[PDB]
Assembly symmetry: D2
Homo-oligomer: 457 residues x 4
């Protein structure tokens, strides 16, 4: 239970407070979503694709205002908030172009073309979204959910209600029908009420493991399907034969993007003994050179963290790790001042029993662990209760492919930079959740896959 | 866990619940079995499927007899269940491997692919109505994907469960790859919460699905829930009446009514209502009921005594609410568990026969004023598994199919599950899909592999 | 469960009642809250007079009430009349003895500066079973009302005729609107009410499954509950027992209400020396009990209340015999339209068997032989339940020693177990928690409030 | 995880791994074997053990108070007072407790039926960090006297205190398993609640923890006592002794740097005296000394948890955004420690964060009441109901209002506190069940009717 309050993390100053939605408001959101769905499900998929293009255009028309809102409410460097808007608008256009074909009926092996599989919409999808990508997280799911013919009803993180209001205004400007996209500032009880309401067909959650478990349990009890995209503690494996400098550049970007607040950030660096010291020296130097400060200044790489309590939790994780024997090579301190800044941090000599190896470090703290050889590296990578994405750097192409097949995660990047992309599946295993987003997966997760069979006699 | 022959009322066997050591052994074996099985080739696994089909065929009569003995199904139907289950093994052996091929993506120059990786041990909770087919409908694709399968079967069919395990071991299914455990609800909970269980699959009642779904969700594990249905069977004025009646009777009465996707709610347009009703009642009255070892019998006893009590109460309530009893609606005297073939007419949407799943030989008939009213009636349900529509108008049938809130729509034919098409529903009928490539992919770790992203 | 009344003697439908809708649930809650708002301000004297008026109104409708109980759930008519008599007497007992229980308590704080006050809590939601449709309701409602609370009842779906009649009786007695009320809520309606701030606390009498489901909801809502659940009461007979009295008490204890009593004597644990003698006398007495139409006063046993429960009971008997129990009498459903099960005795019952580990809620006795008094105690305590217990022995000191070591909430020494307004009722382990009757049932639903002046 | 950090300095004290499966099993096994023996002891023997615990705690009094202050920031003067109160509780129950376990006569004729208070079994306890010793002993003392075992899961930021309490109770000769503790994580707590060796559960803590645990206990058919947060109203009417009301108000709000479930949190003051009360209260609060809690004269320490200071500041920020007037404080103190300024919010109306949520730190909320009827309505307009205070010269009115206040304790013209001699606990979201006096002793008894010769 958090507070419905926006505070600028760079200044510590209050932005706005918003009361939780009352009973009439929750009922109005549900009623409007259902009536919106009733009409939207009857449109042509090509009309829905056009609506996606219109949303993309409205977003681009308000791009700077949107980016400024993201930075103001949650501290993301403005260069990255702008890139978030660019990516989110590109996603609308990508699904408008490629999505409709993914909804074509499928032929079957039943003789004489008598049976097909149709992809029908389910209904209203309740979405519970976090603050780390206030726009991208929303559209990553909403774009294919809408294209499939569903309505989308959003509960956004209570620290980004300004962003949520703005998203709603932009989507309405684009001509999105009333109720097809909407949002409500529900508290926990309000979310439970909605999950249990027959107007909600299914639920999608992006956030913490605890949030995912709480909601997944309620959805299961109500016989409603979920997609849960939860935290990660992604391993980033570097073998002796890697292109060392490229590995370091990808490692630094992977860990420190969005001030480390990324579910699929590179969090556990597992480096083969031969190259470990060279990697560590270079990684530390690059991390120490990262600029941190006012996120309104385009050249700062690191902003403040979004939430004061979350900075306190991360500091405790660093404290615990040092107490357990980790070596602090850089940072490990809250920065004095009224903002919510935490120093770029590196912990080395991290072993599997330590906090920095076992928990998700959701901020600018890298953990470095030395592996005996590639087999040890793989074992260390899989020794985690999370399983979102992973990276492997090695010149041995055959070995990398073999390791990919044995990594217990939903995405593996070989000799490159991990990211989410419309063209490929996103999502993990174990406590990172289940279900997939993007490509045709995100589109079909919220379809009623319907067999239609004529003259079965 | 007691087995009682429903045809005679006599005890067959009692099997104690698995203890803590037995639960631990089942999980340990499943996990070690998976560790080896996940490393096998798809060709080796497809060969195992063929070996399973062969072993089933070699013990086909013994299997059928066991099914009938424990849960009452007419023997001809038990034999058909074995036949369909063995064919499923061969269908997946042939068509399954290609479903596991890596997928190209739109990323340029073949730099990214999607792979379908094994997930781990899948825990299955299965019911007694198709003790073999419900198990294999899921287990065949689950095993082909490289997972292990660990089954908790219905307590009244443990004899069937033992026999299934016996046959799969004979076929050479590695230890732990297929296994089963006679766990009580506490044991099921313990396994769902164990890290060695990767995901869960449930076929059963809404209450069971909700309880298990809640536990799986809390443990961050995905489910597929294939729960009850109250399938609408719509007959419009221009229907082929003789085929509609045949399909209606087969739809409602197969397996003595105990089918999740049975035709349960007959929604008939005014014009044809009386003619349909008269023919339906006559056909239902002509069905023969008795000893399920006697091949002339179309209907056996119901599987469970308490479920017959419950069904009878649903009939009594429907009658008290105003439904017209046209046939049956009585328990049959004797020590067996027989319930008369039953027809309720003048059923309105507020009634028990319309709102609840009637899991036994009881048809509900409701008159629709027009096609729009028929559609509204069909969709006025908390369930959404499958539906049937009979009309001579191809265009109208397709238009209505697009508006039916269920996972399967059969136009002018007999509904059924088939390996070639998706099976599963919406609303309280659950979520997720079985069969075709759907049942294979539900329990895969869909993994993006992208090289050189710079 | 279906919202349907069926006469278990005849198998025929009595009535069907639809579940309460949203408006009806809201009305029940609103009425209970407005009722409590006025009732909490009344004097204890005024409330005690209402209890007397309820007693009078019950007596005025005694035969109609008894007939309704028998009709809906099958209880022999003499036993239904006794349930009405006991319920009316409870009203008078609390009217006389209850008020003093609500007096403020002095404390050891010096100079009378602090007292403890027993204030009403609010609306108490009650979920009650079909086995004593009147007594289980009033057992709780009487003290709950006297304390200044409202009582809102969800009754078992097979006894809604009884529920309706109780409501008309309490209205005739002049019980204010909302102070006593009931609603035919389904499971989703009960959950809704538990989670509504107008419900202050919950009381449940019934099955372990129901108690666990409701207890979880009440805990989650931060609301206190009293759970009075099933039992598998041991009835211990030692070599030196007054055998005549033990057999009479054993038969009455097991077979009252056709065995459908939470605190029934269910597990007979008999010392090796007297086992055969007890068994012979008990089997002969059980065989002599008359079964049939419960409107016929001479019948000792009626049909069981629910068809599904007779089937479950038969399966428990079937499993017990499969496990090795010796069937000494009965063990069969009676042919016909009614829901009759023969009076049954299972012997050679060992701790691993169904008859020993599960609650047998019907006319089935289980007899287990104990090597000595120590083994008897161990067997008695080898159960997931712990409601009440009986010990028959002439050894005064040993009986008291055993009572102290029995894991149950009630122990009867050389007598017949029963609930009584003068003593606590309730158990431990899976039998639940909390206590009904005497001052316990009254204080369970009070806000115990310290009031302390001039603490400086 | 379990990490101790000194809130005055921000520096790490110790980390402690969570109990593993073998450790949890050992804790439950030892508690059960301990109970099996302890339930057979005489009450006189158990009473002597209580006296011995009091003696051992007084022998290590300064070490214990120092540990309390070091781990959670309480001013040392108050940590010492906590030790004094806890040891006094041991002696109080040793003296007055045994008689509470005497069998009760009943109205059944000829003395044939009595009520006995039997031990129930192992009681699982989940305790918070605000009174690391007192919260434990408040329940453990009567639970042990009743013949039960006590198995503790303490707050993860005070495991040093937990280890020290266990050493002291072992030095006193408390049998193995009769008192014990385990550093269990949430999964371990769930495991224990569902284990048959645990008979019942007691929780003192947050509303969220109470609800999570109460749900698990209810599902397991186990009784709870839940002593959760409060937002206690403190009503001051026009005819009050103003200076005494102000002193009691300041003490009630600011004790333990405001981290008390039964703190005075919502000041509801009649319009006639509102401004005078406000001026005096603000002056006294501003004069409180805040700083190093090792300095015997400081009145306020740092708050115990960094995340909780952040949450509290957000509650202040939201209240001000909603229209509350900041009269004092409302800022985190710069530095490495966890200090928050003594704060006063005025013009607080019932729709505001400061009125509707528990403010667990040094933040007073002042609301003006039109008259005594309005004051009572404001007091009762809360989801909480732990205790309350009323200041007025009208004794009859005070008594009338007490009867209508929806809380478990009412203090008239005085200072609220817990005390062994009276019941403690509340209603609504403050939980249910009562501690102390005979209430805390009987909550975890098997109340057993023993009836001879019933016909």
């Amino acid at each position: 239970a958090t507070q419905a309050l926006s505070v600028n993390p760079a200044t510590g100053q209050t932005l706005a407070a918003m009361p939780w939605a009352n009973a009439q408001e929750i009922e109005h959101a549900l009623s409007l979503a259902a009536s919106g769905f009733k009409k939207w499900k009857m449109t042509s998929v090509a009309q829905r694709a056009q609506t996606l293009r219109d949303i993309g255009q409205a977003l681009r028309a308000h791009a700077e205002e949107m980016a400024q809102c993201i930075t103001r409410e949650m501290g993301k460097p403005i260069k990255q908030a702008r890139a978030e808007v660019t990516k989110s608008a590109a996603l609308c256009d990508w699904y408008a172009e490629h999505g409709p074909a993914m909804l074509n009926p499928e032929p079957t092996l039943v003789e004489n073309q008598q049976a097909v599989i149709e992809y029908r919409p389910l209904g209203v999808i309740l979405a519970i979204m976090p603050w780390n990508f206030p726009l991208w997280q929303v559209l990553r799911g909403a774009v294919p959910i809408l294209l499939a013919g569903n309505s989308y009803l959003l509960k956004h993180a209570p620290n980004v209600t300004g962003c949520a209001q703005m998203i709603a205004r932009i989507l309405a400007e684009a001509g999105t029908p009333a109720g097809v996209y909407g949002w409500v500032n529900a508290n926990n009880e309000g979310v439970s009420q909605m999950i249990n309401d027959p107007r909600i067909a299914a639920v999608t959650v992006t956030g913490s493991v605890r949030a995912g478990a709480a909601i997944g349990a309620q959805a299961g009890a109500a016989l409603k399907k979920c997609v849960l995209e939860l935290g990660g503690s992604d391993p980033f494996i570097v073998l002796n034969d890697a292109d060392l400098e490229l590995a370091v550049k990808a490692a630094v970007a992977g860990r420190y993007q969005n001030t480390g607040q990324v579910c699929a950030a590179a969090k556990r660096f597992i480096v083969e003994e031969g190259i470990a010291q060279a990697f560590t020296d270079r990684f530390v130097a690059a991390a120490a050179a990262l600029k941190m400060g006012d996120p309104l200044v385009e050249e700062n790489d690191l902003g403040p963290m979004a939430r004061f309590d979350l900075r306190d939790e991360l500091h405790q994780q660093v404290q615990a790790s040092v107490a357990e024997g980790a070596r602090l090579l850089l940072g490990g301190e809250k920065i004095a001042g009224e903002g919510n800044y935490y120093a770029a941090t590196v912990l080395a000599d991290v072993t599997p029993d330590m906090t920095a190896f076992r928990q998700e470090l959701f901020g600018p703290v890298a953990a470095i662990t030395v592996a005996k050889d590639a087999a040890h590296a793989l074992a260390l990578a899989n020794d985690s209760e999370f399983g979102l994405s992973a990276t492997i750097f090695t010149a041995d192409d055959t070995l990398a492919a073999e390791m990919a097949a044995r990594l217990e995660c939903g995405g593996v990047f070989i000799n490159g930079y991990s990211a989410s992309d419309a063209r490929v599946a996103f999502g993990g295993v174990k406590k990172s959740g289940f279900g997939r987003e993007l490509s045709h997966f995100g589109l079909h997760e919220f379809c009623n896959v319907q067999t239609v069979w004529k003259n079965r006699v």
